[model samples]
Target chain A: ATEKYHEILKKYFLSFETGDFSQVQFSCNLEFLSPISGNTLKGTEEVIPFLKGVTTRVAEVNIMSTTVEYPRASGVWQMRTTKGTLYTLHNFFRLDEEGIVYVWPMFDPKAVMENPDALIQWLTGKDY
Target chain B: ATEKYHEILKKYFLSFETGDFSQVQFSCNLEFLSPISGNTLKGTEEVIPFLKGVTTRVAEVNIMSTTVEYPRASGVWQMRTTKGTLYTLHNFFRLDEEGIVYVWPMFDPKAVMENPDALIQWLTGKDY
Candidate 1:
């Protein structure tokens, strides 16, 4: 299970390393809603370019901590990068579940890019 | 169902107003998970005292905003009080579910007792 979650994250973050926009689409649940955006990205196609564009501009990406937790469900991936320290708490649905995110809510760290430098500083260290 | 949700919140907050620690437990799903605390309350018995302790501490309590949205499934409650502005994003489950919280990951707004002055100031006016 750890490996699978890692794979999902690897593909998503590594896509940034390559500037391969297509990879972002493969990694996410696009119908996924963003808490702040209040807008939904219909599919991988809509989300990929947006992520690719940001990845292309950022200098680094780092995965900090990832945890899969209870009721046998949900987890969080905390990471740091040149842009900032961010976390994505995801509710996952089994592939067979089809459009059902076994977890109820999902959070995207990408939104934190709004305050990149400050976030970067926060992620890069603990003192602050 | 606006009334129901508000009632839930009202029963939840009004509980604080009366120092009825028991009401806090009644309003929340004890099995709710706290991201920061990384622990589940298990039942109302476990949560009410914690809330009572908090309400007893600070000067004032306030409610910011609560929005219920979907998949017709979840919502966020944003609020501000003397302590600070707080937000609780919860996934609600049905009463018959018989567990901690019917929702996926539940968040509590009561933890924001830190930085009380700043939070109070944020709610009282615009400038930071």
Candidate 2:
């Protein structure tokens, strides 16, 4: 079961690396939690938009390490933007047998200092 | 493998419920991080004393929910003391194949309002 879950999680990490959001929609359940902004998206309606925003705004996200224990997986990554700012990301994932997913991602708020407009727009959910 | 890890985690939860600090020392690694006060215990030498304080101060602890995702586990519990105060606990655990363990336990700092001396002493590492 752990191996099976690991395979399932690798798909999501692959999506993050390849800029494909479709896999996430298929794997994640209705409610998804964003840790940095503490926002909860109720359905794909919100999830897809948020994910699209993420994939569009950030470029060159490379997963540095992927660790899996079963129902929980964590990925650490170094994300670089077209503007040349770098951010370190630590993300934790919880997936249930029923396919529901909860994720928490932590990053230094100082990343905003490097790209204020984009970071603030992404974080504050505003169009800059 | 996930099931095996879950079994190992159950023993630790049982110890928390039953107030057996010995189980934790066996399950946890030398370096354990405490989330509430953000202190790290180096080994059983430090771990045992800290656990002893917790067991001595808190009387009854009942786990509300236990969730496992292979090497990571989380337990949410309601802890009650002889003084009739209640506290909520959220604990996360990570165990390696070599028996090394890392844990993070989060609790409300407002718990001190119910029993100032005991909570303060436990958190501050001061002998009040």
Candidate 3:
């Protein structure tokens, strides 16, 4: 991968904190492999909401390791939640000319799942 | 990823069919993320038996797609089970001078789990 490849990833991690990925280009047929019981979400509509929910709950994300094979890559990072919980997530994704073509949220989802309000809010596309 | 990079992956996949990885180097701290409900197995001592069991049960393995970011890559493939079942699996891995450093078996353990004998045999490091 080239330097530009790393930059795209950088912006992606940032999006989780800002919830505003105005600069990042997301694909129409984008696929999101949700870490919640291996559930998969597709297209910009579903994925965007999920991304925003993450941004709302996650305070910061720091990259620790990565694996890139052409269009697909996995950025492993430790994320600090707003309430003080910290955990590592393997952010798996695929890159294309249009920007982020695919992604996988490889997280434990423990903090979010247990929070009744957060779970319902994200699922119903509210608040986050 | 370079040509040598893909070559290493090719050999690693082939090892599943022949049950002989005489040339492939495995990391001493190799981590295997089994897709069996997120169970993880570590080191060569544990990983080898699991790989061998897969080799014995699988008739063939074919790559479908990949994501390569430096030493980490995910080789997605469809494996034909000896009993005629077929499914796609994303073989996530990390490469190093010593060969495979990390790996994730991204497939459901359905076929083997149903077969009580195979499950017990592999778990106890018995009969491949």
Candidate 4:
């Protein structure tokens, strides 16, 4: 049962990475509630807009590592490569049997986000 | 079993609240790893000093609400009064069945920490 769940999560992750928002619609129950944002999207209506915003703003988001807890049955998408090769660590998720995600907070890791050299270069628009 | 576990956790929390460091050392398995600090203290020898630092620095701590995950068996200590009556909300923990805390991350809640009134009052040492 967990294996099947994991497969579903993998497909969801892949869809987000590949910019295929359609696959996202299929996997989720449509009544998806993001734990961090406290925003609930009833179906693909809001999800499409959200994904479109993501696709428009960010690019080349490569997931470096993934960790899944079967107990929670939620996965974290870590070590993201974005902002043109600058790595931003964040989380993505799925839910459990009751279709509830109790936690899905996303924040940039301090060490990576506070890199002085990276910030200085990015500020100056230099190739960092 | 979970009820019994929660009772043990309450004891641990009370130890901190009431300034009974020894009681906390008694309840814990002693081989606790703090996930946020990543500083492992095997016994009360280290915990004693840690509590001492907390005791010296903080005062008037009051727990507003708490939520626990039984399968994970973790508790969050919320709404702390610290730095002389200034409330600093943070997480305090007791570990799982195996006596390990995989996540004990601590951060000041932005709503509390970033309040302009709180900052101004705290900085000016005025009654807020």
lDDT of 3 by residue, A1-128 (tens): 45677677778777777789877777777887664435568888888887787677777778766665557766766677675566545566788877788875544333333343454344344565
Per-residue lDDT, model 4, residue B45, is 62
Answer with 3 or 4, whichever has the higher DockQ: 3
Each prediction's TM-score versus the true structure: 0.38, 0.51, 0.61, 0.48
Candidate 2 residue-wise lDDT, A39-110, digit = tens:
577666776677666766565776655555556565556667545577665455666774327655544333
True contacts kept of 4: 0.00
For every model in order, the TM-score on chain A comes to 0.48, 0.71, 0.74, 0.53
Tens-place lDDT per residue, model 4, B38-127, is 466566666556555454444555543333344343333433445544433323344556432333323332333234345334323356
DockQ of each: 0.07, 0.07, 0.19, 0.10
Q: What is the lDDT of residue A38 in candidate 3?
A: 52
Model 2 over residues B1-128: C-alpha lDDT tens digits?
Answer: 65666666566656655666554425435566653333578776787677666766666777655555546565556677655677665555666773337665554323533344665555444573
Runs in model 2 lying further than 4 Å from the true structure: A1-4, A10-20, A25-29, A34-40, A52-128, B1-7, B11-19, B25-29, B34-40, B51-100, B104-128
Identify the CAPRI category of the predicted complex in candidate 4. incorrect
Selected candidate, larger lDDT, 1 vs 2? 2
Q: Tens digits of per-residue lDDT for model 1 on B98-123?
A: 21233333433123222323432342
Query: Where does model 3 exceed 4 Å of error?
Result: A33-43, A78-88, A106-128, B23-46, B53-62, B77-92, B104-128
Q: Could you give candidate 3's per-residue lDDT for residues B24-123 as a string of tens digits?
A: 7787878887644356688888878777866777787787655655577666666776656665455667877677888865443233323435443433
